[PDB]
Amino acid sequence: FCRFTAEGVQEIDYKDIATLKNYITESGKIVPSRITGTRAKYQRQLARAIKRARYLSLLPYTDRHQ
Amino acid sequence: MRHYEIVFMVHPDQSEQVPGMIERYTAAITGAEGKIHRLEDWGRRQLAYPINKLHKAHYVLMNVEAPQEVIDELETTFRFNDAVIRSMVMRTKHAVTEASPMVK
Amino acid sequence: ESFAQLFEESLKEIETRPGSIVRGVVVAIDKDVVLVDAGLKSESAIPAEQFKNAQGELEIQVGDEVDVALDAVEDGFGETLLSREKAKRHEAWITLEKAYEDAETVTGVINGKVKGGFTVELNGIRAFLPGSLVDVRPVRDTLHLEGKELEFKVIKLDQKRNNVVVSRRAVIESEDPWVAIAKRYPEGTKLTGRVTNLTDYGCFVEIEEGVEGLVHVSEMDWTNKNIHPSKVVNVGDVVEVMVLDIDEERRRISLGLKQ
Amino acid sequence: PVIKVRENEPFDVALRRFKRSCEKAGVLAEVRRREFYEKPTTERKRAKASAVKRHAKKLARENARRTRLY
Amino acid sequence: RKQVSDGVAHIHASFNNTIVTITDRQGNALGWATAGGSGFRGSRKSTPFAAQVAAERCADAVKEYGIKNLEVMVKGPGPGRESTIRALNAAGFRITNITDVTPIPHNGCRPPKKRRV
Amino acid sequence: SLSTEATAKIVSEFGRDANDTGSTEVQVALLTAQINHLQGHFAEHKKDHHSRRGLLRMVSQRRKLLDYLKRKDVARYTQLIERLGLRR
RNA sequence: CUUGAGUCUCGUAGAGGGGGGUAGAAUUCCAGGUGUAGCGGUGAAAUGCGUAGAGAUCUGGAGGAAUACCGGUGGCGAAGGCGGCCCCCUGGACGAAGACUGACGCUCAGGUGCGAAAGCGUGGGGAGCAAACAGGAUUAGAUACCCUGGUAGUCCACGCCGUAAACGAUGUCGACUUGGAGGUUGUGCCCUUGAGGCGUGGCUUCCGGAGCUAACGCGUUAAGUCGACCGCCUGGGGAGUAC
16 A cells, blocks of 8 residues: 555655654654555665665654654 | 756854855856756754754755766865765756745 | 346345345344354344444334345355444445535434543444543533433544544534554554454454454463453454553554453 | 553452553564674574564465465 | 652663662753662662662652652663662652653664674 | 767677678677776776676787787787787 | 667666765763772683772763665676765666567677685774783683784775675576466556456565476476587596696
C-alpha cells in the first residue's frame, strides 16, 4: 500500500519535510518498508531525501541530540 | 549546461546582509550566460539541531543552469565566507521552475 | 463447438466477482454449517452466524438465495468470503440513497458513545458514529427513554474508514491513513472493528480505512497468559476496541479489549 | 525515547509507556548487538540463516497444516 | 547548602553495577549512590533489588536539598533500569520526564572481541 | 561516455550516408575517440582499474574491427589508419 | 543475406570504479566545573584505576576511525569486492522502438592484466580494536580459553606480495526440454472507474516434474538433452614435499 505509486511522484523531495516526517521515527530513525509498505524503489529515494534533510538540519538525526 | 540546485544557510545575525549576497551570487551566474530558474528566500528558520551552537538560521534556495566552473567558484566562496554556515549544491536533471512545498 | 466458447463468455456475462448476484441456493443445512452454490468451482463452508437475524435463530431453509463475496480463490479447497459482508454493500446503498433527496430515513436508536458519537444500529448491524451525529443540537439522549425510537439523520461519515454518526429524535429538523493519524487518537477512543486473523499472540482487529491494530493477548479478557485468543473472542467479528496507543511512524496502533 | 508525564497521569502508567517506547526503539537490542564485534562473515551467516529459518516456518509448516493432526 | 526544587536523576545501569546520581538541572551533581556501595558484591549488585536500594540511598542523600520535581535519564542496559525509577518514585519525587540516554554509535568504534565461553 | 554531439560528428565524417552509424570504419573511429578521451582520465586516475577494464575491452574491440577490415578490404583499412593515425 | 556479433537514438535502476569535500552519533584523551568513595571486572575473584578526588555528572577543545536507522536470501561488479551525504572524472548492465554494419563470431596452451586477509618496503597517521608481550585468574600444569593492560598491525600515499573453504567446493559460449510461489528492475496496452487488469523483456530466491545421479541431491540459473573450445584427475601415504 505505497503512497508514492498512487500519487505517482517522479522523485521524492527532501524539502517536503512534512511528508518525510510520516516516514521518520519519534526517535528520528527512518521507518522500515515492511511497516510503511512503501515500494522498494521509492523507499531508497525516501531514505536519501531524509538523509539530505538531516544534513540541512531540516530533520533531526536523533531525538536526544542538541 | 548542468542544472544545479543550491541551498545555503546563513548565520541569523547576518540576515540583513543576505539579499546582497544573493544578488552577488546571481550576478556571477549571469556572467557565464547561466540562467537562474527559481530563487526562494526561505528566511529565518528553526534548526532541527544546533549547528555551530546556534538554533536558528537563514535558508536560501536557488536553482541555476550554469557551467561547472562557476558552480565550483560559488562553492569556494561559500566555504571561505563565514556568514554562510552550510551549503548544499546538488545536481538535478531538469530546470524545476515550480515552487517548493514549504513556500507553498 | 463455439457453442462452448460463446457459453463461456455468456457465463462470464452472467456472473460478477463481488457478493452482488444473489445466486447461491442453500443446498444443505446442518448446525453449524450452511452451504450454497453460486456457480463457483466449489461450495462455501458458510457459518451459521452470517445467517441468523437479530435474535439468534435461522431464517433461510433450502433453496434460498443470498450472494456471498469473491476475489479470493482457493486456500487449499473451497470457495468464498462470506455473504454477510454482501449485506454491507446493501447498507451502503441505503446510506448513499440519502444523497438523492438529502435525507435517508429508517429508525436510528442511539443510547451511548463508545468513542464520542452515539452508537446507531440499523437492522441487524450496529454502527458507531462521531459524538455530534447522535443529536441535532445539545439535546442528549441520556434523558430520553433508553434505546429510543427515532431514525438516524446523518451528521458525519468518514467515507474511507467506515464510521457513521447519525441524528436521533428531532423529526422537524431537516500516505493516506498515516499523515493525519490524530482522529481516533487522543487516549482511549473506542472503535467498532472486525477482527481478521488471530496469530496466537494476537487478534488483528483493523477497520479504520487501511490500518492495523493488534489487541495482542495481554488484555483481551481479565486473565493474562492461559487465554489463547481463538477461544476467547471469535473469527471475523466487530468488537469493542479502542486505541490505547498510536505510533504514526512505525504504523503500530496498539489497541486493547480489556476496557 | 524522550517522554513527559501528562497532567494527572499515574506513575506506573508512565513507566509502562516509557518501557513500550524503549521496546519500539529497540535500544536494548542495539546495545546487546554492539557489545562485541561480530565478524562480517558471522553477521552475513546469521542473516541468511535467520532468513532460511523464516522461509521454512512460512511454507513447510503451511504445507503441514493442510493435513489434519488426528 | 542552597536548596533546589527541580533536578535530574541520572541512572547509569551497567550489567555489573548500577550508579544513581542526582544532580541539578544545569549539570552539577548533588549526590550519588551505587549498588556496589549499598552493601552488595558480585552476583548481588547486578540485580534490580540492589539498584533500587542504591536509588533509595541516593534519594536519602539529597534530602537536605529539598527536591520535589525530578526528571530521570536512564543510561545503559541492565536490571537497574525500571526498578531504580520505581524506587525513586516511592522515595517521593514528582517524576516529570523519563528519558533514555543510552549511547548508541552510528557505527563508529570497533567493539572488543567476542568472548569464547 | 562520449557526448552525443561528438558522436554524431564522428558518424557524419566517417560514415558514407551519415545516417549509417554502424559502418565498421565509423565504429572504429568512435572507439578511437573514446580511447583518446579516456587516456586523459587514466593519466590522472591510475588506480581506477574497473574503468580501465572497459577501456581495454574497447581497445580489443577496435583491434578486432581493424582486423576484420583488413581481410575484407585493404585500401579502406589503410585509409582509416591514415585518418585516425593508428600505427596498426 | 540478417536470425549471431556489434554501432547509433531515448530513457532506466544501481554500496560499480577513481578523486575531492562535508555531516552527525559514539569511543579515547586534554582543560575546567559539580561531587564523594568507590569504580571496574568475573562463574567467582584478583591484577588494574581511585581521597594526589576516580567512577558518575555537565561545559569546552583535540584527534582518528567507522558510517546506526534505511537494509531486504535487496542492488551493482569478471572475480576479489563495494554501504552516511554532496560534487567532479569514469566503466558496465537493462529496456523501448526504429535505423545501420553484414558473420565482424565462440573458445584459448603460452602471454598480459586485475586479484580478500595477513605480510613486506619508504613516508605519514594512530581514536577504537589487538597478534606479540606483561600481570591476575582458572588448572595437576595452562607457554590457552576468562580478566586488566598492551606493541606491531588495522587507517592514508606510492610500490611489492599473488595466495584463501579466492566455494555454487559446479570452466566459458550457444541451442533445446513440463510447472508453481516470490523478489527486483524496465516496458506495451487497458475505463489506472483504485492500492489494480492482461501481457512482454532483464537479473534474481525458494519448491518441485521428466530426466539425470552412488546416493545425497540437481532440476529452464541442470548436476537434464546436445555441440564448440579449453583446464584438470588416474589408489592411500611419502608430498603439493625434495632437487
